[PDB]
Write a protein that binds this DNA or RNA. Structure first.
Ligand SMILES: [Zn+2]
Lengths: 61, 206, 314, 81, 180
RNA sequence: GGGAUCGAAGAUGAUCAGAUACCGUCGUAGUCUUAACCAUAAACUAUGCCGACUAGGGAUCGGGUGGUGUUUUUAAUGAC
C-alpha cells in the first residue's frame, strides 16, 4: 500500500483484519499454570479487600 | 448508595491483576499519593485496585447521564490506545478521535473537524494535552485515565491505573463500555458476564 | 562417525578444517545461501576442496517445514531475534529428520588481554558478534539420525526445547544442557531473548516499565524443556534518580516559555520521552538506523535523564 | 490539601515530626534502670547523660557521654523505666 | 625483532573507545599489518610489530599517533586521517599561558571561543582547514603546519578579549590570501 | 631589613609591512618584611536589618535518631 491512497480492496480487508480475536484469552490463567505470580505487597492488598484468589508469592526481597 | 451488587467481584479482580493494572511504576506526583497502597523494596508502587473500581463506576454514571450519546468524545493520540477507542465508540454511540487532533477543533468553527462535545474522555493527559487545554476554553468537563506520574490540571475525574501496558489500556476501556451498557438497558443483568472478549480491544502489532 | 547428516552452521564451517569433521558424520549438509555468502579466502580453499569431494551437500528446506518451524519459534518468542537465514537452518535440519525417521513423534509438538593478529582477525570479529567460536561455552552436560552444530545461542535455545540434537562441534558430543544470558523484567517477571546488539531495550514490551529490564543468567534442559533463571540471593536495590521534578505542559509557566512564534521547528520546544508509543520515540529509532548506515559507508542519543538528574549542572 | 483535620493528626505522622513542632511539645528522652555485673545495686540513668556515671558501691563506670545518647558499658544490663 | 608502544586512555574517553573498538582495530591490523590488543588490566592499548610481515619503519609511529589523537578527543573520522595522510600535526596550549584569569572571567573566555551554538568555533575550522577541540581550559588544534598557526593567532585574540565581530572580518582576509 | 622574579619612570633597537600594527634589550621606585600613616574600588547579589505567612521534590555540606541492612572481624568503632 501507499499513503494517501485507498480503494475497496483495502477497505474490505481492513474491516476483516481488525475483527480478529484469539480462541483463548491472553488473560486466561490457563496460560500461566493456573496461578498469578505476585509480590508480598500485592497479596497484602488482596487480603485488605477480602476476596480469595489463587495467588502465588515471590519474595522479591 | 448503590446496592451491594455493585461491589468488586472476585472474577473481575483476576482480570485486573492479570493485566498488571496495579503496577504504578515510579516518579510519583505529590497529588495521587492517595490511591497508593504501598511501595515494594525495588521501588515500584502498588495502586489500590479497590479504589480503581469505585472511580470507574462513578465515571460510568456520568457518561450515562448525557442526553444523547454522540455528544461523548473519546480521544487517543498514542497508538496503543487507538483500537480501544474505536471499539468503545462502536458499542456505545460515542465519537472517536484517533491520531492527530488538529488544533482548533473545539474553538474555530469553520473547520472541517469542528465539534461541540458535551464530555471528553482522554487516555493520557500528558500526550493529549492539546485536547484538554482547548476544552478549558469552552466549559467542557474532562475524564482521564491517569498513572501516578500524570499531571493534574483541568482533569475532573481521574481513574488510577497502569497507563502504559498494552493490556492495561485495553482492559480499562473494555470495562467502561460494559458498565455504561449495563447502566442502560442494553445488557439485561449485572450477574451474567458479557459475551465480548477483552482481547477484541487489544493492540495488534504485526 | 557418530551421526547421520550433521548440519554445519556458518561458524563451524569457517573455524575448522573438513579433516577435523570427517571423523564425526557420514554426510554433511548446508543451506546454499550460507555456503555462498562466506568469504574468508583462507577458508574458501579448504571449503572448495571439501565441496569438490562431493561429501558436502547443499540442500534447501521445503516451505512447509519453514512455516511449521516459524509458528513454533513465535511461541517461544525467539522469532523476533532469529534472522531469515537462521530459520532456514532450523527448517533444513529438521525436515531431514522427517526423511530419516518415520513421522514426527520424536519432537515436541508445542512448547512445554589477548593479542589480535592478522591470522586471528576473522575469529576475533566473530567473537565481537557474541557467537561462541570456542564451542562448549557454558555447556553443563532415532539414535543420532540428525545433529546440528551451531555457535549461536538463539538457535541453540530453540533446538533444545523442541528436543532437537545439538552437536558440540569442537568435541563431537551431544549437548543436553547449557547456561547463557537472557533479559528479565523485575517488575512483571517476564523473560525475553537478549537482542543481538547485546544490551537491554528501554521499555518492557509487556508491562511498559521503563528501564526495568535486567540481564539474567538462564539454563535450559532438553530433558524438561523448561527455562530456569538464576538469582543472586543478596541483591541490593539501587533507587537513585527514580523521582524528580518535571515540567507540566499546561502550567502558566509552560505557556509563557512556549512563546509567540507558534511551533518552532528548530529546537522544537523539546518534550521528554516517557512512553514507548510516543511519536517522538518513533523518529529517534529510525533516525538512529539512518545515521548508522550513512556514517559507516562514508567512513568506508539517550532517553530518560539517568541516575544523577537531581544533581545540579553548572 | 484544601480540607484536612488539624486537630486529630495521625499517630504515624506525628511520630516523625521534630519535637518542637508537634501539636504540643514534649521530650523524647527517657530513664533507665541499670545494674553492673557485680553488685545487686540498681541505679537510674538518663538516656542522654553527659557525666560518666559511676556505680554507687564502687568506682566502676556505667556509661560514657557522646554527641547524643550515652553509650552504656559492656556487661551491664538495663530495663527501660 | 620486536618493538612496541603502550599508550594510556583517560577514564572519560574509556567508554567511547569500547563503543568504537570494532571499528578501529581492522584498519590497523589490515592496512598497517601491526598487531594490537586492549589491556584492560591497566586501561591501556598496546601496539606491537612483527618483523616478518611489515613494510617499513613508519608504520609503528602512524598507529600510535592515530590512537593518541583519539584520546585527546578528536572524532574517529578525524583521527583516521593520520593513517592516510603524512603531514598532519597536533598543537596544544592552555589559556593561562596567554593571560592569567580565574573565575567567571575564565568561564566567559571559553564561551567566547565556542560562540552561541558553537557557530564561532565552526567558523574558525572553515577559514582554516583544521579541527579544534576544547577540553575545559586546554585547546588542541589538528592540521597542517601553516594552517595551525593561522588558527592559533585568531583563537588567541578571542581570549585576550576582542569582540567576535572583529574576528570574523580577519577570517575573511586570510581566506582570500589562500585563494591568491 | 631584604632585594630571585616581574617591572610606572628612564636609557636604547626598528620604522618595514594592514591578521599577526604594537614589537626587542637593560632597568630605578615598587613587588616581600618590621614599626607608624592613609580610609578609597563596578568595596556588586548593582537588592538595609528583625519577625510571621503563602511550596513541593531530591542532590550536597555539618549534627542527631532508627534499621531483622552490606563490608572490615569472631564484638565496639570506621566506611557504605
Ligand atoms: Zn515488565
Amino acid at each position: 500500500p501507499v499513503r494517501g491512497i485507498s480503494f475497496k480492496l483495502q477497505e474490505e480487508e481492513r474491516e476483516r483484519k481488525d475483527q480478529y480475536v484469539p480462541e483463548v484469552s491472553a488473560l486466561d490463567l490457563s496460560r500461566s499454570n493456573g496461578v498469578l505470580n505476585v509480590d508480598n505487597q500485592t497479596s497484602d492488598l488482596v487480603k485488605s479487600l477480602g476476596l480469595k484468589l489463587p495467588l502465588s508469592v515471590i519474595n522479591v526481597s | 448508595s448503590l446496592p451491594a451488587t455493585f461491589d468488586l467481584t472476585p472474577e473481575d479482580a483476576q482480570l485486573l491483576l492479570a493485566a498488571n493494572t496495579h503496577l504504578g511504576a515510579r516518579n510519583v506526583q505529590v497529588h495521587q499519593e492517595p490511591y497508593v497502597f504501598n511501595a515494594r523494596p525495588d521501588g515500584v508502587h502498588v495502586i489500590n485496585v479497590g479504589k480503581t473500581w469505585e472511580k470507574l463506576v462513578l465515571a460510568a454514571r456520568i457518561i450515562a447521564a448525557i442526553p444523547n450519546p454522540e455528544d461523548v468524545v473519546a480521544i487517543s493520540s498514542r497508538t496503543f490506545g487507538q483500537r480501544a477507542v474505536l471499539k468503545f465508540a462502536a458499542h456505545t454511540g460515542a465519537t472517536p478521535i484517533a491520531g492527530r487532533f488538529t488544533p482548533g477543533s473545539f474553538t474555530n468553527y469553520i473547520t472541517r473537524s469542528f465539534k461541540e462535545p458535551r464530555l471528553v474522555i482522554v487516555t493520557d493527559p500528558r500526550s493529549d494535552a492539546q485536547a484538554i487545554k482547548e476544552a478549558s476554553y469552552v466549559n467542557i468537563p474532562v475524564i482521564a485515565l491517569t498513572d501516578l506520574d500524570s499531571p493534574s490540571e483541568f482533569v475532573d475525574v481521574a481513574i488510577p491505573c497502569n497507563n502504559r501496558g498494552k493490556h492495561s489500556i485495553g482492559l480499562i476501556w473494555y470495562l467502561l463500555a460494559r458498565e455504561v451498557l449495563r447502566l442502560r438497558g442494553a445488557l439485561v443483568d449485572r450477574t451474567q458476564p458479557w459475551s465480548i472478549m477483552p482481547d477484541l480491544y487489544f493492540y495488534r502489532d504485526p | 562417525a557418530h551421526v547421520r547428516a550433521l548440519i554445519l552452521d556458518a561458524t563451524p564451517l569457517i573455524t575448522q578444517s573438513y579433516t577435523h569433521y570427517q571423523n564425526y558424520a557420514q554426510s554433511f549438509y548446508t543451506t546454499p545461501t550460507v555456503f555462498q555468502e562466506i568469504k574468508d579466502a583462507q577458508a574458501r580453499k579448504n571449503l572448495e576442496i571439501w565441496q569438490s569431494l562431493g561429501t558436502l551437500k547443499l540442500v534447501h528446506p521445503s516451505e512447509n517445514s519453514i512455516a511449521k518451524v516459524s509458528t513454533f519459534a513465535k511461541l517461544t518468542g525467539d522469532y523476533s531475534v532469529l534472522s531469515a537465514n537462521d530459520l532456514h537452518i532450523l527448517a533444513l535440519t529438521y525436515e531431514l529428520e522427517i526423511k530419516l525417521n518415520n513421522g514426527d513423534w520424536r519432537l515436541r509438538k508445542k512448547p512445554g588481554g589477548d593479542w589480535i593478529t592478522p591470522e586471528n582477525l576473522t575469529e576475533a570479529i566473530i567473537k565481537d558478534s557474541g557467537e561462541d567460536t570456542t564451542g562448549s561455552l557454558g555447556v553443563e552436560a532415532p539414535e543420532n539420525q540428525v545433529a546440528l552444530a551451531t555457535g549461536d545461542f538463539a538457535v541453540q535455545n530453540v533446538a533444545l526445547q523442541m528436543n532437537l540434537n545439538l552437536m558440540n562441534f569442537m568435541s563431537g558430543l551431544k549437548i543436553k544442557r547449557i547456561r547463557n544470558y537472557m533479559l528479565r523484567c523485575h517488575a512483571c517477571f517476564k523473560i525475553f531473548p537478549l537482542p543481538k546488539d547485546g544490551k537491554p531495550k528501554h521499555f518492557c514490551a509487556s508491562c511498559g516499565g521503563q528501564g526495568t529490564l535486567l540481564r539474567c543468567a538462564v539454563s535450559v534442559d532438553s530433558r524438561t524443556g523448561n527455562v530456569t533463571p538464576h538469582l543472586k540471593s543478596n541483591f541490593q536495590w539501587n533507587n537513585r534518580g527514580n523521582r524528580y521534578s518535571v515540567a507540566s505542559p499546561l502550567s502558566k509557566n509552560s505557556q509563557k516559555r512556549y512563546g509567540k512564534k507558534g511551533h518552532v521547528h528548530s529546537k522544537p520546544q523539546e518534550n521528554v520521552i516517557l512512553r514507548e508509543d510516543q511519536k517522538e520515540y518513533e523518529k529517534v529509532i529510525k533516525q538512529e538506523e539512518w545515521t548508522r548506515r550513512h556514517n559507516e559507508k562514508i567512513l568506508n542519543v539517550r532517553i530518560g535523564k539517568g541516575r544523577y538528574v537531581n544533581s545540579s549542572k553548572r | 490539601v484544601l480540607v484536612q483535620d488539624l486537630l486529630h493528626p495521625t499517630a504515624a505522622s506525628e511520630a516523625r515530626k521534630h519535637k518542637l513542632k508537634t501539636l504540643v511539645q514534649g521530650p523524647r528522652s527517657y530513664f533507665l534502670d541499670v545494674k553492673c555485673p557485680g553488685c545487686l545495686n540498681i541505679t537510674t540513668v538518663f538516656s542522654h547523660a553527659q557525666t560518666a556515671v559511676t556505680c554507687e558501691s564502687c568506682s566502676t563506670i556505667l556509661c560514657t557521654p557522646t554527641g547524643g545518647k550515652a553509650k552504656l558499658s559492656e556487661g551491664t544490663s538495663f530495663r527501660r523505666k | 625483532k620486536f618493538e612496541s608502544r603502550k599508550i594510556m586512555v583517560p577514564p572519560h574517553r574509556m567508554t567511547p573507545l569500547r563503543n568504537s573498538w570494532t571499528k578501529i582495530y581492522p584498519p590497523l591490523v589490515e592496512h598497517l599489518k601491526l598487531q594490537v590488543r586492549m589491556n584492560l588490566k591497566t586501561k591501556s592499548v598496546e601496539l606491537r610489530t612483527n618483523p616478518k610481515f611489515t613494510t617499513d619503519p613508519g608504520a609503528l609511529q602512524k598507529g600510535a599517533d592515530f590512537i593518541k589523537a583519539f584520546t585527546l578527543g578528536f572524532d574517529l573520522d578525524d583521527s583516521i586521517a593520520l593513517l592516510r595522510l603524512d603531514d598532519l600535526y597536533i598543537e596544544t596550549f592552555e589559556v593561562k599561558d596567554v593571560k592569567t584569569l580565574t573565575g567567571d572571567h575564565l568561564s566567559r573566555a571559553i564561551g567566547r571561543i565556542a560562540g552561541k551554538d558553537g557557530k564561532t568555533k565552526f567558523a574558525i575550522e572553515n577559514a582554516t582547514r583544521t579541527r579544534i577541540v576544547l577540553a575545559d581550559s586546554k585547546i588542541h588544534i589538528l592540521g597542517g603546519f601553516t594552517h595551525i598557526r593561522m588558527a592559533r593567532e585568531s583563537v588567541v585574540s578571542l581570549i585576550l578579549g576582542s569582540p567576535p565581530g572583529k574576528v570574523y572580518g580577519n577570517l575573511r582576509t586570510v581566506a582570500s590570501r589562500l585563494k591568491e
